[PDB]
Symmetry: D2
């Protein structure tokens, strides 16, 4: 019938918000998780209450077989895969001199290999449709760099190149590939001190933090027919922090 | 009551299309023109048939008093100015060695000074509202440069800096300032030869030209509540030509 | 046997670029708008380096005056190998406050100026089939800056012009590039400016000669495959 | 009295960077993965320049091997003033076809490698309170490239790492920068490649030494205010 989506890391935070938003615009949504089965299942129902179809599917994005099993299963339930949103991601923060090998390895695994994994395994099916929209999550630090986050930054910049390169491969066959880059978004920011919040806000011309839903909005737009001539672009949603 | 817009150079092409699109999303629209009174007046009615309010207003954007008179008049009719879209623009193409002084002067006047003119004169009113969205038209060549168009390119790049700088000034007061950059869009392209079209298409991974409405779509999105955390950004709508 | 022309070479960054080009063996023509004395003083510092040098008065925003200037440089030196478009002004104001004259004047010197120089310098560089053109931009041309919508416009616009000229002139041996300095010491304007200092990872203001080093490098045989580029020289304040 | 380490310095671009650093007075340590003979040959060409030099075998994707390598460079030269992260591989394939090993291997050498070198080289450069690190990226890191989603990922990722390390190490005198070469002659792989040539305004492929010139420049006292930057060396193919 209508059109359907997969969001990685959609059990909580921006992913949850993205998925809900795709439900509002009428996508059936698959809610990937790594370990939070119950919160996923909860979002699966929050999505149903929107009158569309949903289910949770567990899978570590760093592992290529689990990703293949996931795509196969979303195609099996839904009949198609119209929108892929690669949102799953971890930080393991340290100055370069204190960074352990497993803090590098793991971040790359999830944040960069994961996105490649998801992109690759979603491709036979999108080429079959001759249609599709892939949106990757990056971050303001992917553009400006940030001390203490070299691994994470490497992933986010790298994600942006993966976007351009994928965009280039699949363009002629109906598939757009894009990135969204959030600046400071309310999440944890909810037990930070006044001193620190104010330090953060002086970096943001709009003088406020961003919301879940600002990111969700930009993602949906990218997935919508109304954006099918946009490809290989990163949209920065950061209230002016980086221009 | 509801919310209202001004589009410069909206008598034809992308401007026309933008304005219509703002009418669909329910803005009252003012249709600025420089000289094509009748085509403007026609678009004014195309807009009314959308159930919203409209009128034409003539004004050369390069002249600061005429721009002030225009803003004053849009505020007088509408009660507000919620969206300003600076679309008016001319080319005067020549290699640098053949470029006459009036070919430089004129392009700068319209394409760069004009946008400054429109931005400045729209500001007392947007600061009064403590709300607003300004969207500037640029172009793929603003990013990559292009032989034979040094004047035009200078304007389009410069427009992009004007966007960042304006974005920075007005951010704390509720106003977002952004740019859209079209690649190859169907317009004149309608009497070009096969040989040339194909030469143009091999530059575009999506392997087609863009439409009026792809630009309009991105502009409306930028003007909408759904984008109020986006500022000082240029969106490239170019089917992958530049990433 | 090699020659350069630096616009606005009477003081500050141009003064320093002029000196480094001389330091490296260019005869250097020193352009100024009103600072006759100071420019001739720069001329003397250049002469003492062992190269040839003279002062030339021309308003860069005037094409006839630019043309006359180019012809006189070719006259004295026999060539024009390097053009450094450095002349630049600011008329800062909030958007609300910016006067037409403040916009007009800036766009004229900062952007029309560069166009004129590049244009009138082209035939000579085409006849040599070689040439280096270097344009001063600024960090604010990439990131924007409140108070400066006129200046920012011109500096971003100079980057677009650089690209377009690079592309037009590539195939006949000419490189067109830009340098975008960050917060440089020149223009010593005591205040709450260590706020700016916190924006610079290297934790100092750059110097004159830092920009002069990049400009000289871009002008040498060692950067002949680099064209259309903007080199940010800014201590890391913009990456 | 000044010293450099170049990774992948046995042939191609590293070979040429190693030679230019020597040309300018650095003792140069030549790193290789398997090309012992060719690297020792490079060593000999460097020795004949009047500086000191030796070959050092280490897989950049291995942190222990990188650590050992750094310690041995410090051992022989008494310092590490310049690190040039050049070692790089490609395993090209369409997305549909790319094998896990092809992804893993590339991310490991191209991106994990750079991380390791920077990391293990840091203490030494911090104790000197001075230092230049230069990372090889590529034009395709900025613009993307079909067939190369693994390589592109690493080259864009190396630019992010460069920024982040620039920022972490700025305040103790160290510059971190990158060079992104375009289509360079090295790797002579007769075909329909003049298609690539039409993409280059300068209308020739760049050379080895063109990249070596930029790398040497970035490593010198004349670029000490430049950090976090990517310098595109590409004839204008990407501006
Ligand atoms: N929040 C912010 O201010 C900003 C966020 N970003 C980026 O946006 C994206 C969303 O961030 P945010 O909402 O903060 O994230 P959260 O930490 O809130 O959520 C992490 C999500 O990722 C999933 N996940 C982690 N590892 C794996 C894995 N190996 N396989 C499958 N799923 C995995 C988690 O699943 P599970 O619940 O099962 O653990 C979880 O759902 C990220 O890529 C982040 O880097 C960028 C800039 C700012
Ligand atoms: N078309 C394309 O492929 C691309 C276009 N662009 C840019 O997008 C924008 C729209 O372009 P396009 O649709 O092709 O334009 P058109 O040439 O079709 O329309 C020009 C419009 O600008 C108005 N105008 C010109 N000068 C003035 C002035 N001094 N004062 C007020 N209005 C003026 C004209 O009014 P009047 O009718 O009265 O003459 C007309 O409405 C431009 O800025 C253009 O540079 C960028 C990339 C590609
Ligand atoms: N200082 C900084 O932190 C930054 C500077 N820049 C740019 O660097 C460049 C050099 O600036 P800086 O040296 O600091 O500026 P200065 O104010 O020191 O000098 C300006 C120079 O330009 C000349 N000039 C001004 N108008 C004209 C004209 N119409 N025709 C010919 N020459 C003219 C002046 O000559 P005369 O003495 O005769 O009037 C003077 O030599 C400028 O382009 C500037 O915008 C960019 C980023 C930062
Ligand atoms: N050529 C071009 O047009 C472009 C090249 N670049 C980049 O420039 C850099 C140099 O490339 P180029 O000289 O052409 O490449 P080459 O193929 O000529 O050389 C690769 C070098 O890296 C070494 N190497 C490979 N893996 C390892 C490892 N695991 N540990 C230590 N050393 C290793 C090789 O040493 P050994 O001989 O022992 O195997 C060799 O010295 C690369 O980073 C490349 O990606 C960027 C853009 C364009």
């Amino acid at each position: 019938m209508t059109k359907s989506a997969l969001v990685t890391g959609a059990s909580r935070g921006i992913g949850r918000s993205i998925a809900l938003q795709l439900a509002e615009e009428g996508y059936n949504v698959a809610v990937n998780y790594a370990g939070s089965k119950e919160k996923a299942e909860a979002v699966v129902e929050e999505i149903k209450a929107k009158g569309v179809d949903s289910f949770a599917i567990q899978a570590n994005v760093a592992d290529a077989d689990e990703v293949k099993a996931m795509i196969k299963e979303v195609v099996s339930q839904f009949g198609s895969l119209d929108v892929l949103v690669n949102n799953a991601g971890i930080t393991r923060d340290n100055l370069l001199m204190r960074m352990k090998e497993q803090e590098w390895d793991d971040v790359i695994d999830t944040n960069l290999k994961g996105v490649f994994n998801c992109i690759q395994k979603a491709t036979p099916q999108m080429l079959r449709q001759r249609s599709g929209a892939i949106i990757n999550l990056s971050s303001v630090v992917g553009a400006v760099g940030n001390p203490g986050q070299a691994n994470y930054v490497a992933t986010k910049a790298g994600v942006i190149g993966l976007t351009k390169s994928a965009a280039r491969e699949l363009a002629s066959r109906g598939i757009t590939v894009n990135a969204v880059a959030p600046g400071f978004i309310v999440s944890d920011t909810d037990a930070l001190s006044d001193e620190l919040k104010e330090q953060m806000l002086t970096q943001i011309p709009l003088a406020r933090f961003g919301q879940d839903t600002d990111i969700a909005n930009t993602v949906a737009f990218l997935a919508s027919d109304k954006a099918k001539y946009i490809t290989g672009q990163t949209i920065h949603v950061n209230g002016g922090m980086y221009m």
